Design brief:
Blueprint: H1 4-14, E1 15-23, E2 31-42, H2 46-56, E3 60-63, E4 68-73, H3 79-88, H4 95-110, H5 117-127, H6 136-141, H7 160-170, E5 171-179, E6 186-197, H8 201-211, E7 215-221, E8 224-231, H9 234-247, H10 254-269, H11 276-288
Antiparallel strand pairs: 1-2, 2-4, 3-4, 5-6, 6-8, 7-8
The protein binds four DNA strands through strand 1, strand 2, strand 3, strand 5 and strand 6.
DNA sequence: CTTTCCACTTATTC
DNA sequence: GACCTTTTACC
DNA sequence: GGTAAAAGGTCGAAT
DNA sequence: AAGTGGAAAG
């Protein structure tokens, strides 16, 4: 079983709540609904979804194209398990707001209100604040429903278990091989990083104080912006970052990448990265980790 | 009528 | 998220 | 004068 | 991450 806090961290990173309000000619109100929670991952981490499915005892696993796989929970009684978990081990990113909306929709459907037009309208109001908001057809059918900005969620990191889950989803353990004017001509630089949308700037900034190291990079692509929490000082990587995830085990393929990363850290600690033999081993490690891995 | 699941695509936050 | 080169800091 | 740390990104694809 | 169409089932 996956640790509940690690699960919530991973959910904060990768999870999503869904509310389908579909035009249905066979429905009494002309609309049918579907409520749920889902995680879609690369095929290589199917084992994560299976473990979550085994832990919660709910949800359906299915292919999501040829390179991805999804765990979806939409069966209404099973949603109580979802609610139970996140009431006890709450999300802390802006996704908490999505969960709260998911919970509101559940209440409407529990009382069977969604089978009446007033319940549908209420669900539309809920959906308008959920994820990417209303669709064009729903906006046209319910013009009185106005896109109101959501309030900001501001929660602190609850513990290192949550962080392990979150890092399992968003983190990167990287070995940078820098062309250098040194004896060996190559500088070995370990980099730890966590990426997140700027909507959770407060959470990302807190990482600096929560981990006692690192800095924030502000990145952008066209009109989109995100943040990168980065650590490049080796003493911080060795004495702070590595012990955290040694004690709080990562999940998925990324665990293997972290362990290869630690192999390099050990060589750097022993100053072997300044020898031909050590550099050779490091180059071989780098080639087989992250995107170099083969499945 | 209503719920549930399967197949599959697309935009962008990793 | 994984990856890169160039630049700057440090002793 | 040699080594480490930071800067400042790019872009393909797993969310 | 977030969405769509389709349809089996009682
Ligand atoms: Mg995420
Ligand atoms: Mg991930
Ligand atoms: Mg994305
Ligand atoms: Mg994402
Ligand atoms: Mg990856
Ligand atoms: Mg990803």
């Amino acid at each position: 079983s996956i640790n509940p806090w690690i699960l919530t961290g991973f959910a904060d990173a990768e999870g999503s709540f869904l509310l389908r309000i579909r035009n249905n000619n066979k429905s009494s109100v002309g609309y049918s609904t579907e409520l749920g929670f889902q995680i879609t991952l690369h095929n290589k981490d199917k084992s994560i979804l299976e473990n979550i499915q085994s832990t919660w005892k709910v949800g359906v696993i299915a292919n999501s194209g040829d390179n991805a796989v999804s765990l979806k929970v939409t069966r209404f009684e099973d949603l109580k398990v979802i609610i139970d978990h996140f009431e006890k081990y709450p999300l802390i990113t802006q996704k908490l707001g999505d969960y709260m909306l998911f919970k509101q929709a559940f209440c409407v459907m529990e009382n069977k209100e969604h089978l009446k037009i007033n319940g549908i309208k209420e669900l539309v109001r809920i959906k308008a604040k959920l994820n990417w908001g209303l669709t064009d057809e729903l906006k046209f059918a319910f013009p009185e429903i106005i896109s109101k900005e959501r309030s900001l969620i501001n929660k602190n990191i609850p513990n290192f278990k949550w962080l392990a889950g979150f890092t399992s989803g968003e983190g990167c353990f990287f070995v940078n091989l820098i062309k250098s004017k040194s004896k060996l001509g190559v500088q070995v630089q370990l980099v730890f990083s966590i990426t997140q949308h700027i909507k959770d700037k407060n959470l990302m900034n807190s990482l600096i104080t929560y981990l006692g190291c690192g800095y924030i990079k502000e990145k952008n692509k066209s009109e989109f912006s995100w943040l990168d929490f980065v650590v490049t000082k080796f003493s911080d990587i060795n004495d702070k970052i590595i012990p955290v995830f040694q004690e709080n085990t990562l999940i998925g393929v990324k665990l293997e990448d972290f362990e290869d990363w630690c192999k390099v850290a050990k060589l750097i600690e022993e100053k072997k990265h300044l020898t031909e033999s050590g550099l050779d081993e490091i180059k071989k490690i780098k080639l087989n980790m992250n995107k170099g891995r083969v499945f």
